[PDB]
Amino acid sequence: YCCGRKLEFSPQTLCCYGKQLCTIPRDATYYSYQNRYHFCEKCFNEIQGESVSLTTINKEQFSKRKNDTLDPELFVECTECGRKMHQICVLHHEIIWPAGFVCDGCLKKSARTRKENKFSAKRLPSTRLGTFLENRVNDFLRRQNHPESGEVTVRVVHASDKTVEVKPGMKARFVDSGEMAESFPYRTKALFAFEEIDGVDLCFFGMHVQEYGSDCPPPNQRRVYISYLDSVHFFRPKCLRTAVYHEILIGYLEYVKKLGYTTGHIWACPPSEGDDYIFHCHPPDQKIPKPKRLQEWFKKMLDKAVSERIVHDYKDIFKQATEDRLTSAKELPYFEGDFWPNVLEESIKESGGSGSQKLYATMEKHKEVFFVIRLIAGPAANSLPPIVDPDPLIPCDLMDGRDAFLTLARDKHLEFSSLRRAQWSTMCMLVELHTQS
Ligand SMILES: COc1ccc(C2(C(=O)N3CCOC[C@H](Cc4cccc5[nH]ncc45)C3)CCCC2)cc1
Ligand SMILES: [Zn+2]
Numbered sequence: 001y002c003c004g005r006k007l008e009f010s011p012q013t014l015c016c017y018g019k020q021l022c023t024i025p026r027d028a029t030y031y032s033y034q035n036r037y038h039f040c041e042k043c044f045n046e047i048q049g050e051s052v053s054l055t056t057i058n059k060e061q062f063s064k065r066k067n068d069t070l071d072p073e074l075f076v077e078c079t080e081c082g083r084k085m086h087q088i089c090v091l092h093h094e095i096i097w098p099a100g101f102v103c104d105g106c107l108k109k110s111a112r113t114r115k116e117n118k119f120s121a122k123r124l125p126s127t128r129l130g131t132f133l134e135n136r137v138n139d140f141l142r143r144q145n146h147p148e149s150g151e152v153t154v155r156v157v158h159a160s161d162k163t164v165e166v167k168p169g170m171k172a173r174f175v176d177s178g179e180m181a182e183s184f185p186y187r188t189k190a191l192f193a194f195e196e197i198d199g200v201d202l203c204f205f206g207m208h209v210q211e212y213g214s215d216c217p218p219p220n221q222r223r224v225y226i227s228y229l230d231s232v233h234f235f236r237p238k239c240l241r242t243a244v245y246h247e248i249l250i251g252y253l254e255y256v257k258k259l260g261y262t263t264g265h266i267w268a269c270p271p272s273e274g275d276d277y278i279f280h281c282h283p284p285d286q287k288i289p290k291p292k293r294l295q296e297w298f299k300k301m302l303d304k305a306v307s308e309r310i311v312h313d314y315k316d317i318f319k320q321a322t323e324d325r326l327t328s329a330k331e332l333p334y335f336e337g338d339f340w341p342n343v344l345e346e347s348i349k350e351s352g353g354s355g356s357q358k359l360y361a362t363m364e365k366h367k368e369v370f371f372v373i374r375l376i377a378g379p380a381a382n383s384l385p386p387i388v389d390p391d392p393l394i395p396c397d398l399m400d401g402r403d404a405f406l407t408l409a410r411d412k413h414l415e416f417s418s419l420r421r422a423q424w425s426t427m428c429m430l431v432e433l434h435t436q437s
């Protein structure tokens, strides 16, 4: 055996299908039907009668289970030794090495090494935005001159044109009356950061963004929104991990500012317990920050951006609307999946059809969570040329949003819960991106 350890995958968390946001953690009790519809023990017993609509399926046909199934880790056999070894430990992928697995001992005994690993992070197609970010990170790393650090690769893996649609409450008030556009076009992008750790790629950062160009009507035009952020905390060295995140995030703001976007938007929202934003099965000791801590962290990152003469200034949404002399909810930027489109639906219902009644009160209530970042200020923003993106569209269904990658990771036991598993998951992720390309 490679190690002395007996290893297996932890059970993943499933949905309860009752409260539409309820989740079933590890070792919990739940009910299943056809392994498709799972129900919380509390939510299932708080059900009308026996018949449950799914077609009505009776509660008699449901399975009472505990979320404690442990799938053992897989082994691979050396085609010369016969030695059985963990697939994750030796990082053997059948697509990269279709000739069969040969252990390190056999390779050295015959004075050879594995064939070069195609489908690497470096060999992913590059972009102007990706090169811009990885130059910034690697230049910073050489300045710090830590011998433990490795080369960082940043690649944009998806780009497509989409639209966000105004929800029925806001649509009935402002869209049907002609006061607001019914949809806002934007380009979505997914990019990841990789670090070479002992000769092996490790994906440690991911990000999805929404970019609304000069074609977009107000109030969305020339604005960028960060849909989701995620990380795996195994960047080496640890003492430089936060700074690298700052380099990527500030670099993105610097890049879109150069392109002509005037404002960036960040919703400082930590994930719920047991929830994964981009990377499936985070390490158990990678703690989720509390909201106050996360807000201060973004402040520090933005403060550095201001000092670097990249970000002009930043304010919370409540302060921004006051300076913008906002009066109606139709003047607030409308982003896909954002907090505010959902809340404006609730605000109109409670107000009897008003888009202004509790607008400032709601913004003040949640002001510390929403950051409005001004990249271009004053007279310069009034007369800018059209935004032209030098990078082409990158069709990649696996990265059209965060759902496909999470599903693939769930379906293939691709965990990021440890360095070895995250390296195996990185290798599998890279192979998928190269074949789907
Ligand atoms: C102040 O401490 C931090 C500040 C920022 C981050 C970043 C990040 O990754 N965030 C910020 C939101 O909370 C942490 C999420 C990571 C995470 C941790 C544990 C379980 C999870 N499930 N899903 C996501 C997830 C995603 C790092 C780079 C960008 C900001 C991480 C920790
Ligand atoms: Zn092992």
Ligand SMILES: [Zn+2]
Pocket (backbone or CB within 6 Å): 016, 017, 018, 019, 022, 023, 039, 040, 041, 043
């Ligand atoms: Zn539930």
Ligand SMILES: [Zn+2]
Pocket (backbone or CB within 6 Å): 078, 079, 080, 081, 082, 083, 102, 103, 104, 105, 106
């Ligand atoms: Zn061998």
